[PDB]
Structure formats: structure tokens, C-alpha cells
Design brief:
This is part of a larger assembly, with five copies of chain A. Chain A is built from five helices and 14 strands. By secondary structure, chain A is α+β, with helices and mostly antiparallel strands. In chain A, the strands form two sheets. A seven-stranded mixed sheet of chain A has the order 4-14-9-5-8-7-6. In chain A, strands 3, 10, 11, 12 and 13 form a five-stranded antiparallel sheet that branches. Strand 1 of chain C pairs antiparallel with strand 2 of chain D. The PDB classes it as virus like particle.
Chain lengths: 258, 44, 155, 51, 44
């Protein structure tokens, strides 16, 4: 349950002078009907043949291999959901006041500065498609500005105004158009958080459980895999989105060779 | 309004929740009064 | 009370030669009527209902929550006052000799260099609105100069 | 910053007084400078030539 | 007037007084950067 203050403009304070003036009275009001966040599940049923599991498991265990690959697929789906889920996704959660559009198409440094204006209080990172990142680098080259690079998790990422750009292929690119997101993260600073359920039965990884369902008459055993998660944006200014980003335009530079 | 109201204030408060109540529960005196004998293999 | 020296140009010193020349006499004078600084107060009265405080305080204390939010508002007001207060604010305190204007509008690097000239002895930092910061970055991009970045307080 | 209990009124409402005292001093004039008339709404129109 | 005023109350209070400030003070970087050598009897 995400509680919030709904009278920010009615909290009155007074600057005092060297006198006996009366003081204002005030109180802080809360939203009567706060939004409650509820975990959604990504789940599947995996079927493994008992004969295969019994016979072909040295030097590799078949059930464990199947479970590992299925869990990898589930985690990729979770990453996709965190962006594109219709009710808790980032793109759906952004507000019209926090949505802006490109000036004349491709993602220019002026556009990224405009996005930083919308998120000026401790911005965390940009999230973008690799095509959009390449287009931004191309625009920077056209303007003659080489962006610096930072090292995170053993990889190199370009930065703008000190804020790294992070690639994600889950961001949809339709008709050469895409979107770029700017995010602030963490509870202490009223940022974006993810939500998970601890202490699951048959838990393998935090928020993920695997349970044996039974063996059917075809000698096939079934396993249930479930992952519960959600996403919450504590304050509106923690998220901004730039739309109508074009990624298919290349500059024609004049040449004169010796 | 002079101060924060009860309806708004409750949003931060944790309700005390009971286990569901069942109306059909009866004392079932006969089961308590009877003497119960174990059978080895379901035959008496 | 901020005391100050008011005869800076009348403190006479002499560069000596290999001779028996007479030496100047001097003393340091103070401003007769120095400005005295007096604390101003940002204050408020917070009202809390006893029934609410008694009944709805687990797992969060209502009085403490109200006090925390009110104190946050007061601190924001203090930050505003430090800039815009008519008698002790920075904007009111700056002097006409220390005030300059932009050449042709937007905040160009030449303008920022002009400001650094006015404060050349160990400058600390610039203070600006985010819109102005973005405009300065835009002017830097137009001139083809990428400004470097520093990390302070994790930002 | 100080917080003081003021009393409970006849409506069963308690009152708290919060006060913060502060000031600002500039010891020398050259420690502060200001640039005025800064315009923030102008964007440059760059020529484009696409492949 | 409900209570004693600030102007009257200050008469019992001790002001915090700074040492006089001098505007002409400069960092004087050259003196710090130079290396200084002692001379025995004022001749080099």
C-alpha cells in the first residue's frame, strides 16, 4: 500500500520578524484511497520423461538442465514485464507531465538534456534500445562531442552528463520509432522499487519456487515453476520518458580525398 | 478541518484480523461422551 | 557583529633602499558602525487529534510522522529563504559592482568566464536553476565543448 | 530546530510549536557574484543532410 | 504589548564579535610556489 500526502500546497509555514505576530495552524493530510500494489505471477509447467531422467543423466542431470533453461526464459519474461506490463509497467506508469517528445526526430543531446530537466533530483540511469544508443552516438558525432564512458559490472557504457545509458532489447522498436526512459532508484530517495514475496515453499531463488506436481500415465513428470513480482514508483518525478525517437537516419558528410 | 481525520489516519494502521468464524460448529457432546476402541485391521 | 577594516588604502608601507630614509607611520582603522546580524525564525503550529494519536499508531506513530513531514516542509522553506529573503538573502546581498549581465541572452561560456573573473579567489560552486543548467549545456554543445563531470555526495 | 508542546484545546486537539532560527552573512563583498538576464528558452536550429 | 520585546531583551545579551575582515587579502600563490633559500649575511 503506497500512502501519500495530498495537501502539499496547504502546509503553511511563516517567516517570523522581531514582533508578536500570530502564527498559522497546519496539519498534513493523506490520500483517502491509496493505490495498493499486488504481485503478479509468471508461471509455467515443465514436463520431463522419467525414462530420460533415469537413463541419460551422467555427466549432466537432465531435470536440472531443463529447469535451468526454463528459469532463464522466465527471468527474461520478467524483465520484459517490468517494462511493458499494461498495469504496472514503467511505460504505462509514466505521467503525461513526465512525457516529452523529440524536437526533430533523432535523439539529440538537447533532447537528453530536456529529459534530465524532468528528472533533475539524483537521476540514476537511462534505459534504451541498442539502436537508439547508436543513434545518439551518431548525433553526438555529428555535433562533434565525444561522450565519456564508465565501467559497471565489468562492462563499458556511454554516459551523458555523467548518467550512464543502459541497453535493453525488450523496449519495442516499431516503424523505426522507440522510447528512452530516465529513472531514479531506491526507497530512501522516494524512487522506483521492485516488490517480491519471500519465504516461498520450494524456493530456489528469491521470489521463485519449483514444485513437483505428479507423474501422469504416460510416465511423464510435471514441475510447476512460479515467479511473483511487482513494480512501484513512489513519486511521479522519479520517472521520465522521451517518445518518437527515430533510429534510422544517417548524416551525409561531404568528402574531399587527396 | 482542524486536524487529520480518522479515515485518512487508518491507512497507516494495521487491523486485527480474526480467523474465519463457522456458524455450524456445535459442541458435539456424544463424541466426547462415548468410549472409543481401536481396531487392529478395521474388523470388529 | 561583522567588524571590518575601512582604511585599506591608507595602510602605508615602504620599500627600503640601502640608506637611512625616514619610515611612514600607520595604523589600521575599523568601521565605526558595523552591521549586526540577527537570527530570523521559520515557525509553525501543528495540530494533532488525541484520538487519532491514541488509536492509529501501530506500526507507525502518527505524531512522529506529522512532525517529520512538517519539519521537511520547514527545511525547504529555509532553503528558499537563504536565497530570496529581502534583507539577508544572497540576491539582496550581492553588490552592484559584483552584478553583471549576459552579453546576448543565453548563458554562454564567455559569460561564465566573466563571472569567474568577479570571483577569482578560490571560487566554491555555481548555483543555478535546472533550466539554466540545461541552457548552458546547450550553449556548450553549440560551441562544441563538452564539459566534464564531478561526483559529489553520490551525484 | 526546537519542538514544544503547547497544550490541548477543548476539541481534544493537541498543539505543537516548531521553530527554526537561522541567518546568513557574507564576510567580504568579493565572495559573491551574480549573473542576470539569463534566457533559458532558446534552441539552435542546426542544418541537416540525411543519407 | 503582550510581552517583553526583542530590542529591550538584547541589552542583556552578549553579541558574537568577529575579528575585522580585510578585503585586500589574496591567496598570494607565487610566494607559496617559490623555493626560499636562507642567506648567511644578506649577500648572495
Amino acid at each position: 500500500r503506497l500512502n501519500r500526502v495530498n495537501n502539499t500546497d496547504d502546509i503553511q509555514v511563516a517567516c517570523t520578524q522581531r514582533d508578536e505576530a500570530t502564527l498559522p495552524q497546519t496539519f498534513v493530510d493523506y490520500a483517502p484511497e491509496p493505490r495498493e500494489y499486488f504481485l503478479n505471477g509468471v508461471s509455467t509447467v515443465l514436463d520431463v520423461h522419467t525414462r530420460v531422467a533415469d537413463l541419460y543423466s551422467s555427466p549432466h542431470d537432465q531435470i536440472k538442465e531443463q529447469l535451468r533453461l526454463t528459469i532463464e526464459t522466465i527471468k527474461e519474461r520478467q524483465e520484459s514485464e517490468l517494462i511493458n506490463n499494461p498495469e504496472y509497467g514503467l511505460l504505462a506508469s509514466v505521467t503525461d507531465d513526465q512525457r516529452i517528445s523529440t524536437l526533430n526526430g533523432p535523439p539529440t543531446p538537447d533532447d537528453l538534456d530536456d529529459l534530465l530537466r524532468k528528472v533533475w533530483k539524483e537521476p540514476g540511469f537511462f534505459l534504451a534500445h541498442p539502436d537508439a544508443i547508436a543513434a545518439f552516438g551518431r548525433e553526438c558525432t555529428r555535433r562533434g562531442v565525444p561522450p565519456p564512458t564508465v565501467s559497471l559490472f565489468g562492462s563499458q557504457f556511454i554516459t551523458w552528463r555523467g548518467i550512464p545509458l543502459i541497453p535493453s532489447n525488450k523496449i519495442p522498436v516499431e516503424d523505426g520509432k522507440t522510447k528512452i526512459l530516465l529513472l531514479r532508484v531506491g526507497e530512501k530517495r522516494q524512487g522506483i522499487v521492485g516488490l517480491f514475496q519471500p519465504g516461498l515453499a520450494g524456493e530456489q531463488s528469491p521470489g521463485l519456487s519449483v514444485r513437483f506436481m505428479g507423474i501422469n500415465r504416460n510416465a511423464i513428470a510435471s514441475y510447476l515453476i512460479s515467479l511473483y513480482c511487482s513494480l512501484a514508483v513512489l513519486t511521479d518525478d522519479a520517472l521520465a520518458v522521451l517518445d518518437d525517437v527515430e533510429v534510422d537516419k544517417y548524416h551525409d558528410y561531404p568528402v574531399n580525398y587527396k | 478541518q482542524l486536524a487529520l481525520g480518522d479515515h485518512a489516519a487508518r491507512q497507516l494502521a494495521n487491523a486485527t484480523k480474526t480467523a474465519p468464524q463457522l456458524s455450524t460448529i456445535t459442541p458435539r457432546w456424544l463424541t466426547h461422551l462415548l468410549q472409543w476402541i481401536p481396531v487392529e485391521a478395521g474388523i470388529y
